[PDB]
Amino acid sequence: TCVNIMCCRCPX
Amino acid sequence: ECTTKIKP
Amino acid sequence: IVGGTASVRGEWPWQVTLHTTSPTQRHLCGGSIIGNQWILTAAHCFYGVESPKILRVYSGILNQSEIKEDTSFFGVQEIIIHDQYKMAESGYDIALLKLETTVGYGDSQRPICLPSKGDRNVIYTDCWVTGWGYRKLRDKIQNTLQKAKIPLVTNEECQKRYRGHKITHKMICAGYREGGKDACKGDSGGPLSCKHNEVWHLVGITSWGEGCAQRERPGVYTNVVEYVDWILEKTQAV
Numbered sequence: 001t002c003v004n005i006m007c008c009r010c011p012x
Numbered sequence: 013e014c015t016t017k018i019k020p
Numbered sequence: 021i022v023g024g025t026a027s028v029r030g031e032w033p034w035q036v037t038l039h040t041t042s043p044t045q046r047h048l049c050g051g052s053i054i055g056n057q058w059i060l061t062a063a064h065c066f067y068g069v070e071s072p073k074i075l076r077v078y079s080g081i082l083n084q085s086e087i088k089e090d091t092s093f094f095g096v097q098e099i100i101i102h103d104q105y106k107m108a109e110s111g112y113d114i115a116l117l118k119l120e121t122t123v124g125y126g127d128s129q130r131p132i133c134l135p136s137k138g139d140r141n142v143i144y145t146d147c148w149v150t151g152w153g154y155r156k157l158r159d160k161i162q163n164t165l166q167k168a169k170i171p172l173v174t175n176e177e178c179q180k181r182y183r184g185h186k187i188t189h190k191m192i193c194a195g196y197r198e199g200g201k202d203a204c205k206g207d208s209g210g211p212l213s214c215k216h217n218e219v220w221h222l223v224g225i226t227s228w229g230e231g232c233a234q235r236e237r238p239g240v241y242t243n244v245v246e247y248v249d250w251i252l253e254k255t256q257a258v
Contacts, residue, residue: 015136
């Protein structure tokens with residue numbers, strides 16, 4: 001959101 | 013028709 | 021999906037689109053039909069989802085269009101998270117939806133086979149990842165389901181590009197060292213499907229990755245063969 005780039009493809 | 017299958 | 025092309029109706033009959041209804045109705049995650057009442061998706065899709073009553077599973081969809089208020093859907097009776105799951109990066113990113121209704125199979129919706137524990141000695145050459153997700157970072161949800169062919173990398177090579185993450189036996193990676201093709205926001209929970217020897221197999225669940233289609237940073241997927249027993253535990257229960 002962008003807090004974690006390892007989660008750019010997850011919702012959120 | 014799959015070797016590993018989930019019975020309905 | 022970054023760097024992908026459009027699928028045709030019938031090309032990924034096991035791909036579902038998972039919607040939530042509150043506050044809005046939006047696309048949330050991918051998922052794969054694996055049995056006549058069972059969707060296999062990612063644990064992380066349900067952060068702050070605390071009731072299955074707000075979930076709609078849509079099968080046989082090509083275009084995110086196709087849906088509105090009178091379109092058929094499957095209600096989700098039960099959400100099954102892996103009991104050891106904390107976060108994507110940490111592993112165990114696997115979850116089952118037990119649907120209320122029974123899925124009728126056809127040309128626009130069929131199940132995909134899980135791998136056989138005695139076939140991790142298969143090296144898969146022909147793998148695709150599918151989804152309605154972003155084509156780039158800072159995009160929006162796609163109308164038409166996208167596809168992208170992607171090469172598996174070995175977990176040894178994956179570990180080197182994710183220094184400071186434990187790349188476990190139960191994860192598997194796929195991407196072009198070039199970069200350029202990958203999943204992105206919205207594709208998570210989607211399948212990673214590999215054709216081999218006539219048949220399609222559900223090899224990975226899109227779980228996490230550094231950015232999207234980034235150089236030298238392949239996507240990380242739940243390695244489904246390491247959870248077949250876990251899947252059979254929940255879906256064959258007495």
